[PDB]
Design a protein around this ligand. Structure first.
Ligand SMILES: *[C@@H]1O[C@H](CO)[C@@H](O[C@@H]2O[C@H](CO)[C@@H](O[C@H]3O[C@H](CO)[C@@H](O)[C@H](O)[C@@H]3O)[C@H](O)[C@H]2NC(C)=O)[C@H](O)[C@H]1NC(C)=O
Ligand SMILES: *[C@@H]1O[C@H](CO)[C@@H](O[C@@H]2O[C@H](CO)[C@@H](O[C@H]3O[C@H](CO)[C@@H](O)[C@H](O)[C@@H]3O)[C@H](O)[C@H]2NC(C)=O)[C@H](O)[C@H]1NC(C)=O
Ligand SMILES: *[C@@H]1O[C@H](CO)[C@@H](O[C@@H]2O[C@H](CO)[C@@H](O[C@H]3O[C@H](CO)[C@@H](O)[C@H](O)[C@@H]3O)[C@H](O)[C@H]2NC(C)=O)[C@H](O)[C@H]1NC(C)=O
Ligand SMILES: *[C@@H]1O[C@H](CO)[C@@H](O[C@@H]2O[C@H](CO)[C@@H](O[C@H]3O[C@H](CO)[C@@H](O)[C@H](O)[C@@H]3O)[C@H](O)[C@H]2NC(C)=O)[C@H](O)[C@H]1NC(C)=O
Ligand SMILES: *[C@@H]1O[C@H](CO)[C@@H](O[C@@H]2O[C@H](CO)[C@@H](O[C@H]3O[C@H](CO)[C@@H](O)[C@H](O)[C@@H]3O)[C@H](O)[C@H]2NC(C)=O)[C@H](O)[C@H]1NC(C)=O
Ligand SMILES: *[C@@H]1O[C@H](CO[C@@H]2O[C@@H](C)[C@@H](O)[C@@H](O)[C@@H]2O)[C@@H](O[C@@H]2O[C@H](CO)[C@@H](O)[C@H](O)[C@H]2NC(C)=O)[C@H](O)[C@H]1NC(C)=O
Ligand SMILES: *[C@@H]1O[C@H](CO)[C@@H](O)[C@H](O)[C@H]1NC(C)=O
Ligand SMILES: *[C@@H]1O[C@H](CO)[C@@H](O)[C@H](O)[C@H]1NC(C)=O
Ligand SMILES: *[C@@H]1O[C@H](CO)[C@@H](O)[C@H](O)[C@H]1NC(C)=O
Ligand SMILES: *[C@@H]1O[C@H](CO)[C@@H](O)[C@H](O)[C@H]1NC(C)=O
Lengths: 340, 40, 240, 46
């Protein structure tokens, strides 16, 4: 649904506190503002992508105190009241299963210097002018929007999508579903205890699958890994000579006088300018893959969660009954329920 | 008397929908709504 | 329905006349096109380390053997400025294509049709949509049915009348608290529960939450009214 | 006749099969004929 926001300031990346270099970098004109402006365009689009996927209700629905859903057991996908973050059991699995780089939540020297400065990459990225901004919506606010869509789905069916939420008993909602897939509603009511046991058992396999297998969240970990590998590659390009006598502007300025320091520095400015434009082009292209994924995820939220879909194999494999959204780090997970 | 305030954003109006194992809400009336969508 | 629609179009007419914050998606495209060209024109001012931003000054001051070194800096920085503009435009143009293919999909599914897709053709249940042109874009006026004034009702998944269980053919069983009816799912038009409104399957022991009420047979008053005719004829024909 | 609908003669449909179609109004009218004959049979006596 999104990727890590980043701002990279052209000045501390290229010139790294050298005012001497800064007076050369101005000779390349508006390239710095184009980079800053670009990355700001990507960073605002991450909040928009998250807003369009999750904020599909203007009302925060909540579940009734009595869980009488006709024998269906949503307790594993609904919020847990006992937890300090209002995640469901399946969301707390999904949140452990992705290993992040920089949430943006206040990095403040004591964590940055000394013992941790060896193993941690994220502090060194910050020291070189690369910064990761936090999302507009916390993982608590995504968990609340996901709760509203799920509590709306189990209490109200599709009606909370089309207008105000209208209560219906859950076995009568599930009958309107069966009728949608061309199965007559008495096939639910005559088999309801079996249909609930099949659903409750199937939700149990999601618990076990997510607890067991390492490959499940590959579509999300490969976003976090591309963010981290591109940032590491951009930090590593500060090591490059570009044909100058040193990788470090302070060395060149220690050794040389202005007349030829300008020639050694011009090379480092050039290549560094080229290293940022490469990263920002790669990030603009990636951001278009993530926006194409977010617009699909918003379309699936609208058509599989707020509704029921006639579209074959769109809302999982089978004939679609309903779907439950779940939050994940930088993503969304749909539990599609299908009649097979 | 105007100033810049800062606040945690409200996600929407809080709403406990009145579910029960034998209760249904049915609309007795409708509004035709016209809505504008804009695309490049 | 016509008065609601005529008033709803009247609010589009007023809204578009009133508020500046509406065509923001289109003005953003014109602004990004204008900004990118202004930035590419401003890059002609940049020295790139040459003695001047202006190519004729270098050709005024210097002879070819070193004018070419000053020129090669400007060629390099300018050529990098074009590739930056053209990459930005190639990327942006893919966003406008994605927007156009969505608009073509909405033209096909919302204007040339009616969509069962929830929230694809405006907020509500989709009835129809009207396209309107705009500078570099399209506006769709989506027309939607929205259910408005609800009442609560008691409901049941089935009715029991003769140990046989009954389900609606279409719609849902509702009760005002004293009597029972079928209504269509999305609008309250209650009807007497009959063998035309409902279908039978199995007996009342399997359906959780089934309720007792009579189910009317509309053929029975015909055969009853003809039984009264039959008796009055037989009673008369005791006399001849 | 409530599970099915009628259109055309059997000569046009490729692969059509013969079977009875039940009319649920017919046993109502048959039971109404047995009721009519027991009334007329008793009516021989007065
Ligand atoms: C909905 O399904 C839930 C998941 O199966 C179920 O919760 C589970 O219920 C069992 C039986 O009560 C618990 O088993 C444990 O019970 C206590 C817990 O302190 C232990 O002392 C026992 O040794 C035993 O291990 C599960 O732990 C419990 N799981 C969770 C995640 O809570 C619900 O009860 C079902 N809801 C309804 C309404 O039936
Ligand atoms: C269904 O909802 C309709 C609104 O969406 C509602 O229409 C409204 O009806 C009232 C009267 O009940 C009208 O009120 C006006 O009526 C006359 C003038 O026409 C005056 O005597 C009144 O003082 C008052 O001005 C509303 O103008 C009318 N609104 C619209 C948009 O037509 C229906 O009554 C509702 N129908 C049912 C069956 O509940
Ligand atoms: C639940 O819906 C029922 C059907 O609309 C409704 O019953 C109907 O109530 C009206 C009075 O409000 C009766 O109207 C008759 O009243 C007397 C009867 O002797 C006559 O003088 C009148 O001319 C008129 O015919 C209806 O006859 C009656 N229908 C039936 C089938 O009994 C209930 O009142 C509703 N209950 C609630 C709680 O809203
Ligand atoms: C819905 O209507 C049903 C028909 O009136 C009714 O079923 C009847 O229920 C009673 C009580 O369970 C049974 O009464 C008999 O119970 C035992 C023998 O089974 C005896 O001890 C009693 O003396 C008495 O004979 C009826 O036999 C039973 N009738 C049928 C045809 O099943 C339901 O109870 C009603 N349910 C509700 C909630 O209204
Ligand atoms: C399906 O049921 C049909 C009705 O019972 C049946 O039609 C009958 O078919 C036979 C053979 O074609 C006809 O028999 C007559 O054929 C000629 C005259 O047409 C004579 O030489 C024979 O002696 C005999 O009279 C029936 O007349 C015909 N009935 C009707 C109403 O058309 C189909 O054959 C059955 N098909 C199958 C596969 O079961
Ligand atoms: C639909 O019903 C809900 C709740 O159930 C009703 O509660 C009583 C008021 C009574 O009508 C019972 O027979 C029903 O079972 C209604 O929700 C209440 O709304 C009012 C404000 O209008 C609020 O003060 C109460 O706290 C709400 N109660 C609960 C439990 O949430 C709702 O108003 C009914 N809708 C309509 C259109 O009548
Ligand atoms: C509905 O809930 C009540 C308690 O409020 C319970 O007694 C009843 O058995 C339930 N009925 C059904 C059909 O689930
Ligand atoms: C009674 O039967 C006679 C014929 O036998 C007929 O003329 C008369 O109209 C009948 N009246 C009624 C009320 O059926
Ligand atoms: C079906 O195939 C059989 C041969 O297996 C053939 O005799 C028959 O005519 C075919 N029937 C139809 C309705 O096509
Ligand atoms: C026969 O007719 C008489 C009235 O003439 C009636 O009392 C009796 O019950 C009838 N019996 C039958 C079997 O119809």
């Amino acid at each position: 649904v999104s990727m890590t926001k980043t701002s990279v300031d052209c000045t501390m990346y290229i010139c790294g506190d050298s005012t001497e270099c800064s007076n050369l970098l101005l000779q390349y004109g508006s390239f710095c503002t184009q980079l800053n402006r670009a990355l700001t365009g990507i960073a605002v689009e991450q909040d928009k992508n998250t807003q369009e996927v999750f904020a599909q209700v203007k009302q925060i629905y909540k579940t009734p105190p009595i869980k009488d859903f006709g024998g269906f057991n949503f307790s594993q996908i609904l919020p847990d009241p006992s937890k300090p973050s209002k995640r469901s059991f399946i969301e707390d699995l999904l949140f452990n299963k992705v290993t992040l780089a920089d949430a943006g939540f206040i990095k403040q020297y004591g964590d940055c210097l000394g013992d941790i400065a060896a193993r941690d990459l994220i502090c060194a990225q910050k020291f070189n002018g690369l910064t990761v901004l936090p999302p507009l919506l916390t993982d608590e606010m995504i968990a609340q929007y996901t709760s509203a869509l799920l509590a709306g789905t189990i209490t109200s069916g599709w009606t909370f999508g089309a207008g105000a939420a209208l209560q219906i008993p859950f076995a009568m909602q599930m009958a309107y579903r069966f009728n949608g897939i061309g199965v007559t509603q008495n096939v639910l009511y005559e088999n309801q205890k079996l249909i609930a046991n099949q659903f409750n058992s199937a939700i149990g396999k999601i618990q076990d699958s997510l607890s067991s297998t390492a490959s499940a969240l590959g579509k999300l970990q490969d976003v976090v890994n591309q963010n981290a590998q591109a940032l590491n590659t951009l930090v590593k390009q500060l090591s490059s000579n570009f044909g100058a006598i040193s990788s470090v502007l302070n060395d060149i300025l220690s050794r040389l006088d202005k007349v030829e320091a300008e020639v050694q520095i011009d090379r480092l400015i050039t290549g560094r300018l080229q290293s940022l434009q490469t990263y920002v082009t790669q990030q603009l292209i990636r951001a278009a893959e993530i926006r194409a994924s977010a617009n699909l995820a918003a379309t699936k939220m609208s058509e599989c969660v707020l509704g029921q879909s006639k579209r074959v194999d769109f809302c999982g494999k089978g004939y679609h009954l309903m779907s439950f959204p779940q939050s994940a780090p930088h993503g969304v997970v749909f539990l599609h329920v299908t009649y097979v | 008397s105007q100033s810049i305030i800062a606040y945690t954003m409200s996600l929407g109006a809080e709403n406990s929908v009145a579910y029960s194992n034998n209760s249904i809400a049915i609309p007795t009336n409708f509004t035709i709504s016209v809505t504008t969508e804009i695309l490049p | 329905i016509a008065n609601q629609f005529n008033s709803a179009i009247g609010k589009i007419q007023d809204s578009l006349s009133s508020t500046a914050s509406a065509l923001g998606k289109l003005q953003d495209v014109v602004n990004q096109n204008a900004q990118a060209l202004n930035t590419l024109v401003k890059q002609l001012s940049s020295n790139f380390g040459a003695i001047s931003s202006v190519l004729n000054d270098i050709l005024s001051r210097l002879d070819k053997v070193e004018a070419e070194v000053q020129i090669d800096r400007l060629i390099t920085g300018r050529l990098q400025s074009l590739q930056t503009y053209v990459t930005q435009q190639l990327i942006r143009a893919a966003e406008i294509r994605a927007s156009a293919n969505l608009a073509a999909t909405k033209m096909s599914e919302c204007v040339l049709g009616q969509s069962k897709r929830v929230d694809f053709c405006g907020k509500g249940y989709h009835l129809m949509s009207f396209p309107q042109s705009a500078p570099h874009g399209v506006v769709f006026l989506h027309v939607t049915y929205v259910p408005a004034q609800e009442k609560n009702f008691t409901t049941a998944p089935a009715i029991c009348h003769d140990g046989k269980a009954h389900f609606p053919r279409e719609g849902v069983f509702v009760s005002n608290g004293t009597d029972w009816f079928v209504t269509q799912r999305n609008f309250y038009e209650p009807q007497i529960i009959t063998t035309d409104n409902t279908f039978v399957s199995g007996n009342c022991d399997v359906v959780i939450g089934i309720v007792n009420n009579t189910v009317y047979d509309p053929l029975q008053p015909e055969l009853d009214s003809f039984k009264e005719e039959l008796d009055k004829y037989f009673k008369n024909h005791t006399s001849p």
